RNA sequence: GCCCCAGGCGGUAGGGGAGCGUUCCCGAUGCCGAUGAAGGCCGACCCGCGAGGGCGGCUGGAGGUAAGGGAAGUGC
RNA sequence: GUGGAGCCUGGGAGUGAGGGCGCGAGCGAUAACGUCCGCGUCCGAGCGCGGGAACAACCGAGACCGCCAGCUAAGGCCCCC
RNA sequence: CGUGAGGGAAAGGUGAAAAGAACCCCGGGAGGGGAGUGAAAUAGAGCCUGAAACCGUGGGCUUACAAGCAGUCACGGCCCCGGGGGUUGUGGCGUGCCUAUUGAAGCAUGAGCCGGCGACUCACGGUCGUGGGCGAGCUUAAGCCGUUGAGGCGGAGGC
């Protein structure tokens, strides 16, 4: 019984190519180029999953450092403050406070220096 | 709870005295204000740092023998087209271009960086045509 | 009035009448949950240190859900190493009822 | 018992070890033959016994 | 309403005639007749015949008034390339693809 | 394959990829590698296994009550509707695929056209046709050759 | 002369890029002041066969 | 004791294990099919870690085929 | 000392071009990203991750996955960062 | 194609039925539009369906201070369907694949791209394991007889 390629190769290609929509040029038109582009896109997606967390953490540390310096202290001193103060709100929430709750974040400064 | 992004904010002008301050340090703080990383609403992917104007760029000061031992060089692409320029001559000609070079050395690259450099305005001497923009004086 | 709560090793600024997703908690849908409050965000700005003393939010679970299928897919080059793998992280999406003082 | 009830015992019938079918099979690009060598070539070695 | 004629299986380089046809897209009918009439290109004759057959179909077949006849849209797809041999040097042979074209003109009435 | 062994073009300097003749299994039209050949799939199953398993099938249908030894076929005499009135009266509907085993050519020939009946001489008894049909039906003599065959 | 050869295939965008400038400008015509027919300037209107308000060609 | 506990899970050659899919066989004188098969294209729908499977829309117009097993010219 | 520990017997292997690094030697010129050995290591196969600007073997560290959580390693905290 | 021995192609499919498009118009014709048949004509004879590569035409987003293995993450903007989907402006990160190598992004090999063909099997012995039968026993070969897909006999012989 002969089992030609039949429909398999075509269908698999349509899978990878439909995944390759929106790529520049042959990277979204040829199955071969689209395959390889989807490989590198895969590892990219992985290391950017792992990356994005450190990324937003750097954002949070930046904005929080801004709000802290606008009260006379800096990021390291402030974090040492809260850590000494037994406060455990994290970088994201301190960021959204320092943007949205300048008064609340202000009191966070007051207890940070309160540790001092 | 996504991280907050601010809406578009009008850039707040800032005047800075070039006089009496060290080149590298002053350029540092200039770049800092330029990035807008003094603002809690900071975001990297958008230029929301403040406009900056400086006067008395000639009045900058630099440590040691850097007056002459620092050679701003350029390159024309032509053979032997490496044009070395000492710091003194560059002061006599284009001190504002001195600060331009120093702060541009500190800005993040990319089109955002170039637009940020556009966001800066140097003026050697004590004056500048931006009183209409309300240049807020800010000591550093 | 808001408050930052702890959950799944995560901290959430929350306010009453809000739908929020968290780690897949274990609780029957329709049931409610009381949560550690890291800080009362609002008028009575109390600093939970490390948690508020008597406060805790009240959140009814809406139901357990599966996140959109992440296609984590590792790949090494020149080694014939391909790894296609789906992933749909379950979420316990909630409803902020109120914030017990 | 109807024909669709008939089945071998578990493990009574076993897969073959199909080779050369990409990475996911784990038996790919080489058919387990390793890299270059007289053994990895078609035909193989001489009589290994002798 | 729309009209259209098709130069199905026209032996002419489709790329070439596309240059012509991209000179009347978005034009009024009479303007098209002139521009084809004095365009220094071989394809302009073919596009001219396809044009007039088109507009005739509009008035005759589809009964569109000749007043508002502007080129609604037109183009030239490719036909079966007649492959021929060209003897090249050192005995080697090649194949010139004498390219056949399809021409399609569409005539809408420019209202307002 | 019907081609020849003449090398299509030389080994080197021709610019093309190396090839031998077009009879190779890599050209369209070339031969097939490892293609199926005349292959005798038959093999000697153990006698004790054939016999024993046969008895196990008959035990299957028997203990399930789908077995029905029959002595007489007075309704059938070589005509189909004879077998219809018989088997219908014989407690058979047509829904039960029934394995028919007998030595009466009048029975077998008289009922082969039944879409739901599987007819077999008593010698042709075997596990497969026993498993095919819901109900099994045999004559006492067919039962006997069964017994000796399972004896 | 060692037979220069195209290193890679030209992408579609680059091919179309060079083909940007290949537009065919419309041959400017004007109406014949004799017969009101469009025609290229500085030539006898083949419709009227006139030119400069006078007959030249024998249409 | 079907769930809980502890630990484990970079990975080539290579060993092993478990599945997915293709043609054909039995199931099947059955079943699905003009109220539309196969096939093609489309999907932001559901299922599985995946191989993939359904589901739905259109094109297509006549074949397809389970559960559960068998055999391979089986996966580019 | 319970460990993807050990031992025995069978089955299938692949490998028998290795390399860098440190240390101990020879050759070498106490030259070589050199060669040849021993010991350890890593890469190979971990060109997965952070640092080292970039960089397989140097420092940290052995990647099941997801999280817009936290503590830290080498290394850094003047801007780029 | 080869002087010749010889080598050796490609190339199937309308429709149930030609009912194969009378006739009208544009057109030198071709071809086109109508009309007409047709269940259907993107079934029109270059005809089942009709994929991709490729080639156009429209629509949406976007793009001319600008840097890049073409992606990925975030944010944002626009467009659309109503929470999503399409575009990507910026910012961050990011050395194609295969083979062969200690070592490849490699300026080492292969690959223009798409579609299809394409490579671990079969036979017979041996060996290990195993799912089963039997068990100091196990087992049939050829052949014979049966159906015409049904099996049994057959102890020669082997272990
Ligand atoms: Zn005139």
**Residue D28 CB closer than 7 angstroms to strand H?**
yes
* Residues of chain C positioned with their CB less than 8 A from the CB of B1: 12-14, 20
Q: What token pair was written down for E16? A: 């070439």
* Contact call for E22 and G23, based on CB within 8 A: yes
**From A24, which residue of chain G is nearest by alpha-carbon distance?**
G13
Q: Return d(Cα F22, Cα F28) in angstroms, integer.
A: 8
**Residue D1 CB closer than 7 angstroms to strand H?**
no
Cβ proximity of F131 and D6 under 8 Å: yes
Whether chain C has a CB inside 8 Å of the CB on D28: the answer is yes
Angle between helices A102-115 and A75-84 (to 10 degrees): 70
What's the maximum distance between 2 C-alpha atoms anywhere in chain B? 58
Q: Return d(Cα C7, Cα C20) in angstroms, integer.
A: 11
DSSP one-letter string for A32-66: HHHHHHHHHHHHHHHHHHHHHHHHHHHHHHHHHHH
The residue to which tokens 């399809």 are assigned:
E102
Q: Return d(Cα A24, Cα A21) in angstroms, integer.
A: 9
Where helices occur in D1-50 by DSSP H, the ranges are: none
Chains with 3+ CB–CB pairs under 8 A to B are A, C
Q: Return d(Cα F89, Cα F75) in angstroms, integer.
A: 9
Q: Return d(Cα F3, Cα E92) in angstroms, integer.
A: 26
Whether chain D has a CB inside 8 Å of the CB on F129: the answer is no
Q: Nearest-5° angle of CA E91, CA E92, CA E97?
A: 135
* Residues of chain D positioned with their CB less than 8 A from the CB of F131: 1-3, 6
Cβ proximity of E75 and E21 under 8 Å: yes
Chains with 3+ CB–CB pairs under 8 A to C are A, B, D
- Count Cα atoms within 13 angstroms, Cβ side, for C80: 11
- Count Cα atoms within 13 angstroms, Cβ side, for C77: 9
Q: What share of chain F is helix, strand, coil (3-state, %, to 5)?
A: 35, 10, 55
**From F61, which residue of chain D is nearest by alpha-carbon distance?**
D1
Residue D15 CA distance to nucleotide J128 C1' (Å): 17
Total Cβ atoms within 10 A of residue G21: 6
Residues whose CB is under 5 A from ligand 1 (ion)?
G 32, 34-35, 37, 45, 47-48
Where helices occur in B1-139 by DSSP H, the ranges are: 23-35, 66-69, 87-93, 95-104, 110-118
Q: Return d(Cα B140, Cα B25) in angstroms, integer.
A: 10
Examine residue C50 and say whether the peptide bond preceding it is cis (omega within 30 degrees of 0).
yes
Q: What token pair was written down for B121? A: 């305005």
Q: Is F57 left (phi over 0), alpha (psi -120 to 50) or beta?
A: alpha
B81: DSSP letter: -
Q: Return d(Cα E51, Cα E5) in angstroms, integer.
A: 7
CA E79 to chain CA mean position, Å: 13
Cβ proximity of B1 and B15 under 8 Å: no
Total Cβ atoms within 10 A of residue B49: 25
The residue to which tokens 């800066």 are assigned:
B120
The residue to which tokens 């955002």 are assigned:
B112
Q: Return d(Cα F25, Cα A65) in angstroms, integer.
A: 71
* Contact call for G26 and E23, based on CB within 8 A: yes
């Amino acid at each position: 019984p002969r089992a030609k390629t039949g429909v398999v190769r075509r269908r698999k290609h349509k899978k990878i190519l439909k995944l390759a929509k929106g790529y520049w040029g042959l990277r979204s038109k040829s199955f071969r180029k689209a395959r390889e582009t989807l490989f590198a896109a895969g590892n990219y997606a992985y290391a950017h999953r792992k990356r994005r967390k450190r990324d937003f953490r750097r954002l949070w540390i930046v904005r929080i450092n801004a709000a802290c310096r606008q009260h006379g202290l800096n990021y390291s001193t402030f974090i040492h403050g809260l850590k000494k103060a037994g406060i455990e709100v994290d970088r994201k929430n301190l960021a959204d406070l320092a943007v949205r709750e300048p008064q609340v974040f202000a009191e966070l400064v007051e207890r940070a220096k309160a540790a001092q | 709870m996504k991280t907050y992004v601010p809406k578009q904010v009008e850039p707040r002008w800032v005047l800075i005295d070039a006089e009496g301050k060290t080149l590298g340090r002053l350029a540092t703080k200039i770049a800092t204000l330029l990035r807008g990383k003094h603002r809690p609403d900071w975001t990297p992917n958008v230029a929301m740092g403040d406009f900056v104007v400086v006067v008395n760029a000639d009045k900058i000061r630099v440590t040691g023998k850097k007056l002459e031992q620092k050679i701003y060089t350029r390159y024309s692409g032509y053979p032997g087209g490496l044009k070395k320029i000492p710091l003194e001559k560059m002061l006599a000609t284009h001190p504002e271009r001195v600060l331009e070079h120093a702060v541009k050395g500190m800005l993040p690259k990319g089109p955002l960086g170039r637009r940020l450099f556009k966001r800066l305005k140097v003026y050697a001497g004590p004056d500048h045509p931006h009183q209409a923009q309300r240049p807020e004086k800010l000591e550093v | 009035m808001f408050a930052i709560v702890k959950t799944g090793g995560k901290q959430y600024r929350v306010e009453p009448g809000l739908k929020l997703r968290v780690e897949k908690l274990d609780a029957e849908p329709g049931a409610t949950v009381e949560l550690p409050v890291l800080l009362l965000g609002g008028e009575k700005t109390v600093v939970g240190t490390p948690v508020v003393e008597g406060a805790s939010v009240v959140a009814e679970v809406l139901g357990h859900g599966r996140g959109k299928k992440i296609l984590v897919s590792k790949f090494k080059a020149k080694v014939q190493y391909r790894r296609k793998k789906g992933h749909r992280q379950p979420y316990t999406e909630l409803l902020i009822k109120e914030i017990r003082g | 018992m109807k024909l669709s009830d008939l089945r071998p015992n578990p493990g009574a019938n076993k897969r073959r070890k199909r080779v050369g079918r990409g990475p996911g099979s784990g038996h790919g690009k080489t058919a387990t033959r390793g890299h270059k060598g007289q053994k990895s070539r078609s035909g193989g070695l001489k009589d290994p016994r002798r | 309403m729309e009209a259209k004629a098709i130069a199905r299986y026209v032996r002419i380089s489709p790329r070439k005639v596309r240059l012509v046809v991209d000179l009347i897209r978005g034009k009024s009918l009479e303007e098209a007749r002139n521009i084809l009439r004095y365009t220094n290109k071989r394809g302009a004759y073919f596009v001219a015949k396809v044009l007039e057959s088109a507009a005739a179909n509009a008035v005759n077949n589809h009964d569109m008034l000749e007043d508002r006849l502007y080129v609604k849209a037109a183009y030239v797809d490719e036909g079966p390339a007649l492959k021929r041999v060209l003897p090249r040097a050192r005995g080697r042979a090649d194949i010139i693809k004498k390219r056949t074209s399809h021409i399609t003109v569409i005539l809408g009435e420019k209202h307002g | 394959v019907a081609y020849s062994g003449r090398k299509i073009w030389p080994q080197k300097h021709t610019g093309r990829a190396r090839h031998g003749d077009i009879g190779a299994p890599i050209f369209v039209g070339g031969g097939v590698v490892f293609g199926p050949k005349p292959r005798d799939y038959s093999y000697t199953l153990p006698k004790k296994v054939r016999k024993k398993g046969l008895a196990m099938a008959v035990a299957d249908r028997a203990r399930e009550g789908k077995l029905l030894l029959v002595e007489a076929f007075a309704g059938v005499n070589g005509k189909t509707k004879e077998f219809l009135a018989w088997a219908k009266e014989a407690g058979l509907d047509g829904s039960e695929s029934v394995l028919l085993v007998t030595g009466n050519e009048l029975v077998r020939r008289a009922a082969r056209n039944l879409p739901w009946v599987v007819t077999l001489a008593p010698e042709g008894l075997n596990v497969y046709d026993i498993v095919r049909t819901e109900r099994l039906v045999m004559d006492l003599d067919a039962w006997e050759v069964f017994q000796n065959r399972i004896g | 002369a060692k037979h220069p050869v195209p290193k890679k295939k030209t992408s579609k965008a680059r091919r179309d890029a060079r083909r940007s400038h290949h537009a065919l400008t419309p041959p400017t015509l004007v109406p014949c002041p004799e017969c009101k027919a469009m025609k290229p300037p500085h030539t006898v209107c083949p419709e009227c066969g006139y030119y400069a308000g006078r007959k030249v060609l024998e249409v």
